[PDB]
């Protein structure tokens, strides 16, 4: 289940950085950025393999 709908202004400013890099296809800060997300727990609606992709939102001080 998806837990409602959160304003972009209520998220960390680093989330806006991630959205800007998704639009330009990078360059990305982490190796795992752009890989397929499997959705193996069915939290999101079921879709084909390759429908969903994952990207890091940086946490300041976490390298």
């Amino acid at each position: 289940d998806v837990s409602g709908t959160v304003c972009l202004s209520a998220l960390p400013p680093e989330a806006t950085d991630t959205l800007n890099l998704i639009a330009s296809d990078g360059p990305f800060p982490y190796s795992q950025d752009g890989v397929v997300f499997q959705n193996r727990e069915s939290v999101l609606p079921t879709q084909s393999y390759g429908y969903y992709h994952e990207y890091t939102v940086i946490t300041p001080g976490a390298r």
Binding site: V6, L8, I22, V43, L44, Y55, V57, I58, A62
Partner: protein, 33 residues
């Protein structure tokens, strides 16, 4: 390690999800507020 925050994209117009807890829960992102 890089912390627990991520965005997942789907294929549809503005279909983006935020997680703060390494995929345990998700919310749809409203880019208009």
């Amino acid at each position: 390690t890089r912390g627990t925050r991520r965005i997942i994209t789907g294929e549809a117009t503005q279909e983006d999800y935020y997680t703060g807890d390494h995929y345990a829960t998700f919310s749809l992102i409203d880019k208009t507020c």
